[PDB]
Structures are given as C-alpha cells and as structure tokens.
Design a protein around this ligand. Structure first.
Ligand SMILES: *[C@@H]1O[C@H](CO)[C@@H](O)[C@H](O)[C@H]1NC(C)=O
Ligand SMILES: *[C@@H]1O[C@H](CO)[C@@H](O)[C@H](O)[C@H]1NC(C)=O
Ligand code: NA
Ligand code: NA
Lengths: 468, 468
C-alpha cells in the first residue's frame, strides 16, 4: 500500500544522478515533491526541506544558495499576520465581533445564514480560516439543538465562507503569498506591482460577488420559523454575556490591527526600502509590550512568547520557502527557459481560454492536495508560458492563486471542511454536489475580475519589459 | 521602572535619522538590540526581528537584503539537530540511557556525582540542556528523599554539567552556531574550516578537562553511606522498570542518530555542495517515515508533525538570523572597517592577553544576559580587531564562544540554573561562590586548548589571506 510512495523513487536516483543536463534533475525533484505534497504520508514542511537535500547532490546549487531562499520578505509578512491573528485568538475577541454582528443582522434563517457567511469571510480575511470554523460551528450546534436539510446548509456555509474570504487579504492564506514570492523571484524587475493595496483592490470585490453567489446557491439547493428567530437569540445573548464586558486588552489589539491596516494601505494609495514586511514586524513587535491591563510598571503584557511558539503555522513558512527554493533552482538549472521553449506554439491560442482552462484545472486539483502546494507547483509553468507567448504573466497567475483556494468538497482538501464534517450530518455526497457548482462559480467570477478591472490595475493588455 | 526601557530610545530616533554616516545608524541599532537582549521585558526572537524594522528606515538595507539573511545553512543545521532531539525526548530514551549509565557506574556518592555529571554532559551534547535537567533533577529528589550540604552539590552538578557539555557539539547550543554563521559571513573565503569534525576535536577534550575540574571543585567545597549506596539503587531500578523493555522505536531513533554522527564525521576525516545541513535534513526527514512499530502498511510513524511544531525553539532560529542580519548590515554600512580602523594601536599588545581578557569579560557578562545574544553582539568586534592587528580571528572568537556558555551563577542567566533553584535548597549565595571559580576554571582550560592544539587544527600562528 503506502510503502511504495517513498521507496519507489529510490529506483530513479542512480538513473538521474548522471543525466548530463540539470533541468532533468530539477524536474525529478519537483515531481517527487509534488507526489509527496499530494500524499500526506510525510508532512508538508518536511517535503519543503527536500530542495536543500537534493539540489546539492544533483550539482545544481550549494547548501547555501538554496537555504538562503527559505526566508524572505513574504514569509515574514505572513509571520507577522499570523502573530497578530494569534493575539486576536488569545482574547475572545473574534467571538465578540461575531456575536455583535449576528445580533445586529438578526435571527432570520435567511439573514442568519447571510450573517454567518459574511462574518466568517470577514474574520477569515486575517484570522486563520480553520480558527473561525472552530469558533463558529459550536454556535451553530447550540442554535440547532434549539431539518436535516438545514443543518447541512449552515455547516457548509461556514467552510465555504472561510475559504472564500481568505482570498481577500494578501496574508489570508498561503497561495497569495506564493504569488508574491514568485513575482519577486521570477520577475524581480516587478519590484512592487502586487502589494497589499493593489491585490486587495483586485480581490475584495471578487470575494463579495462570490460570497453573494454562494449564499444564493446554498439558499437554493437546501432552502428553495418564529422560535428559531427567537430561541436562537436567547442563545446568542447568553453566549455574549459569557465573554463579559469589553475587556480592555481587546481594545488595544483592535487599535494595533487598525494601525497595521492603515500603514499597509497608506504607503501605496525614491530608493524604497520600507516594504509591508516592516509594517507587519512593527505591529507584531508592538504586540509584546502593550499592557493588556490598567498600569495604574507593566507586569502584564497582552501577548507572551510561549503561546505564539505553540500557536503559529511554522510549517507553512517552511513550505513557502520550499517554493522559493524550487523557483530559484528552476531558474538556475535551465528548466524555465526550456519550458518557455516548448510552450512556443500556444501563440496561436486566445489567452482567455488559457486562463479559464488552467483556473478550472487548479480548482479541481486542489480538492485533493493542499492549496499552497498546488500553487507553488503550478505558477512557474504558467509564468514561463506567458513569457513565451508575449503575454502578461499576471493574467494567468492571479486566477490560479484565487482558484487554488476553491476547495469546496473533499474534506481532506482543506481542514475547515474536515472540521465541519466532524460534527456528523454532512454526508460527503451533499458536499460534492454543492461544491462542484461553487468551484464553477468561483472560476467565472475570477475570470470576470481579471478581464474587467485587473487590466487597469496591472496593465495586462501590454507585454511588460519586466518579462523580457 | 521598566517603562523607560522601551520608551527612552524614541528620544534618539529623530536625532539619528539624518546622521550623515550609516555606521552610526547601525551602531544605534546594535546598541538598542543589546539593551533589549539583556532585558527580557520584550522576548529575544522579537528583538531579533528589529533589523528588518530598522535598517530600511536608516537607508542601510532594503527589506529583502536583510530578510534573506534570517535563514542559512547554520540555522537549518540547528533545526535538524533540534528535531532529532525532539525524537529522542519523545520516547523516554534519554532516561533509559541515563539509568543504565547510573547503574553501571554504581551508587557511590563520589562516583554517583561523577556519573550524574558525565551523563548530563553526554546528553547535553545533543539534547537541549534544559531537557536533561528536567529529566534528571526528579531522580536526584527521589534519591535524596531516601545533609543540606549534599543536595546543593548534585543539584548544581546537573546544571554545570549541562552547560559544559553543550560546548562539545556544534549544535549543542546557540553560540557555536553563531560562530559558524559569522565565520561564513565575515570570512566567506573560509569556506569550511570550522565544521562539526574540527570543532568537535577542538572542544571535546576541553569539555572533558573542564568537567574533571568541576567535579573536583564540587567534591571539594561541599564534600571535602551504605544506605545511600543501597537505597538509591532500589530507586534507580524501580524507575528503570517503569520505562519497560527496550521499546523498538528507541532502537530506530538510535540508529538514525548514529547515522547522523557518522555522516558528519566521515565527510571530513572539488566544487563541494554537501554541507552538514544536508545531513541533518536527511536524518530529520528520515525520522518521519520510520515506523516505530513492527509492520508485520505503516499506520504508525515515530515522529509526527504536531509535537515538533509544539516542541522546537524557533525563537532561537530567529535569534541566529538576527545575528546574521546584524553582521551583514555592519559589513555593508561601513562600521566594521571603522572599528578595524580604531583598533589599530593594539598591534603592540600580546594577543594572549587579549584572548584571556575578552574571554573572562564574556564569561562575566553572560551571567546576566543570554549566551547567544552575548556571542552575536561580541564576535564581530573581535573579528574586526583581529583583522586590524594582523591576527587570526579564531584565536579570539573560539574562546569567546566557549565562554559565553559559562553561566555558572545567576539563575536568570540560563534556564537550567533556574530549574535547579526551583527545587529549593540552593540559596543563591552558594551558587555565586561555586560559580565564579568555575568561570575561572573554564577560562583557563579554554586558553590552554587554544594555545596548545587549536594551533595545528586551524593554523593560528599565521595570518590567513581569508582575512585580508
Ligand atoms: C532581458 O531582456 C533582454 C532584452 O533586451 C533580453 O535580451 C535578455 O535575454 C532578457 N533576460 C532575461 C533574464 O529575461
Ligand atoms: C581583500 O584582500 C585584498 C588584498 O589583495 C585587499 O586589497 C582588499 O581590500 C581585501 N578586501 C576585503 C573585503 O577584505
Ligand atoms: Na485544497
Ligand atoms: Na548566560
């Protein structure tokens, strides 16, 4: 069974060691790492460390040129975002925001589902999508204890909303960070063309329209009620009180978060040095000295180190670094130029079809693998193709990144779906039926976004000189 | 009180922003980070992230040139060592080795203390010194429940032995890794002159002699017994049984550890690419597929990801990276050349005095700060001095690294001393009296090592061209 998945490649190492052309060796590396990505027999971060273990033997890079690539500005940006998210989770803040929103919108099962989806998307924009599901699903259970075709709807709404809302912030989730990293590496002359501001402008409207379509679809398939308008409130309120009053530390973390947002947007409404990573580190550092209590001599802070050592996806960081290393090795060996020399005859094809086909393919493929793995595997190929056919790479690379998060079925695809299914009445057939359509929805919305307004944001109708 | 420690430096930022010479700005950065190092009001890894937050504003480096420096071959070497250590701790192996050794040596309070110190040093060579103390101190308590001048001796023996034994492996603890990193950065033409093999050869004899002197001293100050020969055995044996038999997974992790050691030594008893980091990653990766049980289809491994996400000092990794970034900024701005131009007139001095004085100073100073912080602050200065006075840098840099771990008092200096003091009868006066002398012992032993055999290992009698 699962033994061949790590012993069979040993057959090829003595065959590929000689192979008097390095792009073959890099290709074998990438294929092996993909096979391990899709199969979690071995973890992900572990496989992200293969490049240092393989590029040397294949005489591609040293252990220095490759290991230097495992931490760059993107990774520390993501790390700062994660730390801020940890501060938010530490104090039951996201629960307070959630309950306030739910009580404002009202308990009307239609508007109820709308509020759940909207707040889940807004929280997922910064707050580690799985965490939001963990926070919210107990609320749904508490509601429902007070139709087997209804529980499925809201339970799926949480996960779909989270996976969608994560695509509205450049931290958000892995794939967007991967896009930023590959843009920096493959296209360094594109110094700062895809930043937090521009990408947010591109993505947030797309997120909103996808969320609208999703709410409509899930209100169709499952729901084509005075107590549940009332006895749901008596649960929301009693859960609200348990948080207690406004909890002074919550205020300070909110202020720090607002400052982060303002600094990210403001710089980009000269010999620049001050990339967004500096801002993230600014606020993350600041989150260790602030008191969390009234000084009336600051014994108490609001964030210690032990929790953030416990609660941070470092494996994700190493995963990104593996992507960086793969891109560097491909650029060095000679594989990228080779692919760009094999994808020449696509010059006759309409690019819109290319974009749509590849986005659909990625949305399908991410439903078995992880999102970030899918992205970091696919993006360099599309980049080389775009360079070859006189096309702007972003045209292809943005929709792929937005699509890699479209894991709307297969609970193994993304943890949130697993968490939702763990509570029972969400038979996988329901998930597949409701997920394929939403994959299509997301693809169409993304294509609309790229061909409508992304043009002017990124100047996609012309062939930039930063893709020679 | 502790408020000025992070608000007073704000006075100087608008004063130092202009400062038409960049070495002043880098110096202010280093001073501030030192002040935060010595004062744990803010954690350590957080302060290690200041360089990305400061070098840009001071127009020294971008956010890319500096953030690229936070992960290099040294850090991943240390990470692999940490992961292997985690595998060891996972299965109660180090306890099994310990009990076997203790039962072999015997329960004779003299030889008992000797066995405790020796095994603690041997385990600390790879196994995260604090962990060994946590493992062993309960054993001492169990023994002693079955002289208030005796408990102090063994209780201090654990911590001293751990802090000494950590200086015998290039993973070991932070300072040695810092030395390797600074050698790579400041002196890159010294490609691989300080590796695991050479440094181990230099250090292990020094560790042995220091441990001998320490055992002698602690047998002097406190201890200038049939039951404790007997009723200690009835505790060791009954603790041994609780581990059960040899626990098949233990065997596999031992085999992996042996393979790691053999690969580290063997390569160094051509266009090299295969540095020790590759080996560490090799074995660390291997530690995720091995079964830990009889396959009789490998449901069970021996190391999952969640534990190593929980139990790994990542803050240490970021700390090292901060050291790397500081060194890069100093080399870029113009500060290193400036220091080398101010330390010219030391050409008239005997280098032996320089080495001894600086080693003593570092051994004193590390008893309030952390070891790794002390090292990464001090080493570039000594390097610049050595370049200036026609001297081999290693002469000065090795003893400083070995000395930074000589935290033989001030429980705040190093966690092991804190753990020992947490159990009571180790009044701080005793610790100081017994610790200053051992600082002197360590300094003398290190000086003997450098001036005796380190010469031939590193060719310290000549001025290498890799220090121009
Ligand atoms: C960059 O552009 C120039 C066109 O003048 C081209 O000759 C050169 O090969 C290109 N280099 C890369 C790395 O794309
Ligand atoms: C390296 O050595 C040469 C001596 O030929 C010296 O001129 C040059 O300045 C040195 N460069 C550095 C960076 O030490
Ligand atoms: Na997925
Ligand atoms: Na210390």
């Amino acid at each position: 069974s699962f033994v061949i998945l790590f012993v069979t490649p040993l057959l090829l190492l003595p065959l590929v060691i000689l192979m008097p052309a390095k792009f073959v060796r890099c290709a074998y590396v990438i294929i092996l790492m993909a096979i391990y990505w899709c199969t979690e027999v071995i973890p992900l971060a572990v496989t992200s460390l293969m490049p240092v273990l393989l590029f040397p033997l294949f005489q591609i890079l040293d252990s220095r040129q490759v290991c230097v690539q495992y931490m760059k500005d993107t990774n520390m940006l993501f790390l700062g975002g994660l730390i801020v998210a940890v501060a938010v989770e530490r104090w039951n803040l996201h629960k307070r925001i959630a309950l306030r929103t739910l009580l404002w919108v009202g308990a009307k099962p239609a508007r109820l589902m709308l509020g759940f989806m909207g707040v889940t998307a807004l929280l997922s924009m910064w707050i580690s999508n799985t965490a939001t599901t963990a926070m919210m699903v107990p609320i749904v259970e508490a509601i429902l204890q007070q139709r087997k075709r209804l529980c499925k709807a809201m339970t799926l709404c949480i996960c779909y909303a989270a996976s969608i809302g994560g695509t509205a912030t450049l931290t958000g989730t892995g794939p967007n960070v991967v896009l930023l990293g590959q843009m920096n590496e493959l296209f360094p002359d594109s110094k700062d063309l895809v930043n937090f501001a521009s990408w947010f402008a591109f993505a947030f409207p797309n997120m909103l329209v996808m969320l609208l379509f999703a709410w409509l679809w899930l209100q169709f398939v499952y729901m084509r009620s005075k107590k549940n308008e009332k006895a749901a409130l008596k649960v929301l309120q009693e859960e609200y009180r348990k948080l207690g009053p406004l909890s002074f530390a919550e205020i300070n973390v909110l202020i720090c978060f607002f400052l982060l947002v303002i600094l990210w947007f403001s710089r980009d409404p000269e010999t620049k040095y001050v990339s967004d990573a500096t801002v993230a580190i600014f606020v993350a550092t600041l989150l260790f000295i602030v008191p969390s209590q009234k000084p009336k001599f600051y014994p108490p802070p609001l964030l210690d180190w032990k929790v953030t050592q416990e609660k941070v996806p470092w494996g994700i960081v190493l995963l990104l670094g593996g992507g960086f290393a793969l891109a560097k090795g491909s650029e060095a060996s000679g594989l990228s130029v080779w692919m760009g020399k094999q994808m020449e005859p696509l010059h006759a094809v309409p690019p819109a079809a290319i974009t749509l086909i590849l986005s659909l393919l990625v949305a399908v493929f991410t439903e078995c693998t992880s999102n970030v793995a899918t992205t970091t595997l696919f993006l360099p190929i599309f980049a080389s193709m775009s360079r070859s056919i006189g096309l702007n790479p972003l045209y292809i690379m943005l929709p792929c990144t937005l699509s890699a998060s479209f894991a709307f079925m297969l609970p193994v695809a993304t943890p949130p779906n697993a968490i939702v299914f763990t509570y029972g009445h969400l038979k996988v057939a329901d998930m597949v039926k409701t997920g394929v359509i939403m994959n299509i929805i997301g693809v169409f919305c993304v294509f609309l976004a790229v061909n409508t307004w992304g043009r002017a944001i990124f100047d996609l109708d012309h062939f930039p000189d930063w893709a020679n």
